[PDB]
Amino acid sequence: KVFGRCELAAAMKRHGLDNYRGYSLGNWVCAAKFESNFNTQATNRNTDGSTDYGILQINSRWWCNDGRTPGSRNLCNIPCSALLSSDITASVNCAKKIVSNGNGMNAWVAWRNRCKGTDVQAWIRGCRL
Numbered sequence: 001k002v003f004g005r006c007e008l009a010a011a012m013k014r015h016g017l018d019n020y021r022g023y024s025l026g027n028w029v030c031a032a033k034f035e036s037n038f039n040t041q042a043t044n045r046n047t048d049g050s051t052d053y054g055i056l057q058i059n060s061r062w063w064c065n066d067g068r069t070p071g072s073r074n075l076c077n078i079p080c081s082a083l084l085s086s087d088i089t090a091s092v093n094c095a096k097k098i099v100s101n102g103n104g105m106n107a108w109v110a111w112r113n114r115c116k117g118t119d120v121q122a123w124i125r126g127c128r129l
Ligand SMILES: CC(=O)N[C@@H]1[C@@H](O)[C@H](O[C@@H]2O[C@H](CO)[C@@H](O[C@@H]3O[C@H](CO)[C@@H](O)[C@H](O)[C@H]3NC(C)=O)[C@H](O)[C@H]2NC(C)=O)[C@@H](CO)O[C@H]1O
Pocket: 052, 056, 057, 058, 059, 060, 061, 062, 063, 073, 098, 101, 102, 103, 107, 108
């Protein structure tokens, strides 16, 4: 599923991401935009053999199991395919664990390079939350 900007903002808010660990909603929407372009089915392979999954591009070497990342941790205790669902619950739940330790949102490279230090509030402009 390819989410709309305000549509995603509303779902994330509902799932308790607004100000989770001090990170305002604009940060999460900005992160999703540059990590997956709001596409829940996005996947990307890395050089170490791991793969990033879903709207928040969660990595298989640490957070989920895809059965092909030799010696990887499954910290969110879920198969990576659960992160590609049109329902973002699984992704949000795992994201909460990720940001809870580590370097906070720096775990998302697109956030660190394209959202951090910018006016993230603009990502939720015009939305009815
Ligand atoms: C969205 C996403 O999947 N991002 C991935 C990053 O999570 C990943 O970074 C590495 O994450 C692990 C787990 O949080 C880090 O390990 C932890 O590091 C802290 C210190 O910051 C330490 O106190 C924790 O005990 C330790 N936990 C474990 C289980 O080892 C690790 O430092 C991160 N590594 C780096 C280079 O940032 C990166 C790198 O694989 O990939 C992203 O896709």
